[PDB]
Design a protein around this ligand. Sequence first.
Ligand SMILES: [Cu+2]
Ligand SMILES: [Cu+2]
Length: 107
Amino acid sequence: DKIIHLTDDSFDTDVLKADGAILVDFWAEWCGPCKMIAPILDEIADEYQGKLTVAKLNIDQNPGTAPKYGIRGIPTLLLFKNGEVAATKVGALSKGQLKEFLDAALA
Ligand SMILES: [Cu+2]
Ligand SMILES: [Cu+2]
Protein backbone atom coordinates (compact mmCIF):
# COMPACT_ATOMS: atom_id res chain seq x y z
CA ASP A 1 0.00 0.00 0.00
CA LYS A 2 3.10 2.14 0.35
CA ILE A 3 3.98 1.40 -3.29
CA ILE A 4 3.01 4.03 -5.83
CA HIS A 5 1.88 2.95 -9.28
CA LEU A 6 2.97 5.66 -11.68
CA THR A 7 1.76 6.64 -15.10
CA ASP A 8 3.73 8.58 -17.67
CA ASP A 9 1.69 11.64 -16.67
CA SER A 10 1.82 11.20 -12.92
CA PHE A 11 5.58 10.68 -13.11
CA ASP A 12 5.83 14.38 -14.07
CA THR A 13 4.44 15.33 -10.65
CA ASP A 14 5.05 12.47 -8.20
CA VAL A 15 8.71 12.01 -9.22
CA LEU A 16 9.86 15.23 -10.83
CA LYS A 17 8.39 17.58 -8.18
CA ALA A 18 9.26 15.39 -5.16
CA ASP A 19 12.02 16.10 -2.67
CA GLY A 20 13.09 12.83 -1.25
CA ALA A 21 14.24 9.57 -2.63
CA ILE A 22 12.08 7.44 -4.94
CA LEU A 23 13.01 3.98 -6.24
CA VAL A 24 11.19 3.36 -9.54
CA ASP A 25 10.82 -0.20 -10.81
CA PHE A 26 10.31 -0.40 -14.58
CA TRP A 27 8.45 -3.65 -15.29
CA ALA A 28 5.94 -5.36 -17.59
CA GLU A 29 3.54 -8.27 -17.36
CA TRP A 30 5.59 -10.47 -19.71
CA CYS A 31 8.72 -10.16 -17.54
CA GLY A 32 9.32 -13.09 -15.19
CA PRO A 33 12.18 -11.57 -13.18
CA CYS A 34 10.12 -8.43 -12.73
CA LYS A 35 7.33 -10.36 -11.10
CA MET A 36 9.77 -12.26 -8.89
CA ILE A 37 11.30 -9.09 -7.40
CA ALA A 38 7.87 -7.68 -6.54
CA PRO A 39 7.76 -9.20 -3.01
CA ILE A 40 11.25 -7.85 -2.31
CA LEU A 41 10.09 -4.37 -3.30
CA ASP A 42 7.11 -4.67 -0.92
CA GLU A 43 9.46 -5.48 1.94
CA ILE A 44 11.73 -2.58 1.05
CA ALA A 45 8.79 -0.19 0.90
CA ASP A 46 7.87 -1.12 4.48
CA GLU A 47 11.43 -1.23 5.84
CA TYR A 48 12.39 2.11 4.25
CA GLN A 49 9.16 3.93 5.12
CA GLY A 50 9.87 7.56 5.87
CA LYS A 51 13.12 7.24 3.94
CA LEU A 52 12.30 5.99 0.45
CA THR A 53 9.19 5.75 -1.68
CA VAL A 54 8.95 2.67 -3.86
CA ALA A 55 7.14 3.13 -7.16
CA LYS A 56 6.39 1.00 -10.18
CA LEU A 57 5.96 1.94 -13.81
CA ASN A 58 4.49 -0.61 -16.18
CA ILE A 59 6.33 0.16 -19.45
CA ASP A 60 3.70 -1.33 -21.73
CA GLN A 61 0.90 0.80 -20.29
CA ASN A 62 3.28 3.76 -19.99
CA PRO A 63 5.60 3.75 -23.01
CA GLY A 64 6.78 7.33 -22.66
CA THR A 65 8.97 7.29 -19.54
CA ALA A 66 11.61 4.63 -20.23
CA PRO A 67 12.87 6.27 -23.47
CA LYS A 68 13.37 9.58 -21.61
CA TYR A 69 15.94 7.83 -19.42
CA GLY A 70 17.52 5.63 -22.11
CA ILE A 71 16.26 2.44 -20.49
CA ARG A 72 16.95 -0.52 -22.77
CA GLY A 73 15.35 -3.40 -20.89
CA ILE A 74 13.56 -4.59 -17.78
CA PRO A 75 13.72 -4.96 -14.88
CA THR A 76 15.51 -1.65 -14.37
CA LEU A 77 15.58 0.34 -11.13
CA LEU A 78 16.09 4.11 -11.10
CA LEU A 79 16.67 5.84 -7.79
CA PHE A 80 15.67 9.49 -7.99
CA LYS A 81 16.64 12.17 -5.50
CA ASN A 82 14.89 15.51 -5.79
CA GLY A 83 13.60 14.83 -9.31
CA GLU A 84 16.91 13.67 -10.84
CA VAL A 85 18.47 10.25 -11.30
CA ALA A 86 20.89 9.51 -8.48
CA ALA A 87 21.61 5.82 -9.18
CA THR A 88 20.51 2.99 -11.43
CA LYS A 89 20.56 -0.79 -11.46
CA VAL A 90 19.83 -2.87 -14.56
CA GLY A 91 18.66 -6.38 -13.64
CA ALA A 92 17.18 -8.20 -10.67
CA LEU A 93 18.85 -8.44 -7.23
CA SER A 94 18.42 -10.39 -4.03
CA LYS A 95 17.04 -8.50 -1.07
CA GLY A 96 20.53 -8.30 0.45
CA GLN A 97 22.04 -7.01 -2.78
CA LEU A 98 19.23 -4.47 -3.18
CA LYS A 99 19.94 -3.17 0.31
CA GLU A 100 23.63 -2.84 -0.61
CA PHE A 101 22.59 -0.87 -3.67
CA LEU A 102 20.41 1.39 -1.55
CA ASP A 103 23.16 1.98 1.02
CA ALA A 104 25.31 3.35 -1.80
CA ALA A 105 22.55 5.03 -3.76
CA LEU A 106 21.12 6.90 -0.77
CA ALA A 107 24.58 8.05 0.36
CU1 LIG B 1 0.75 -2.39 1.74
CU1 LIG C 1 1.44 -4.17 -0.17
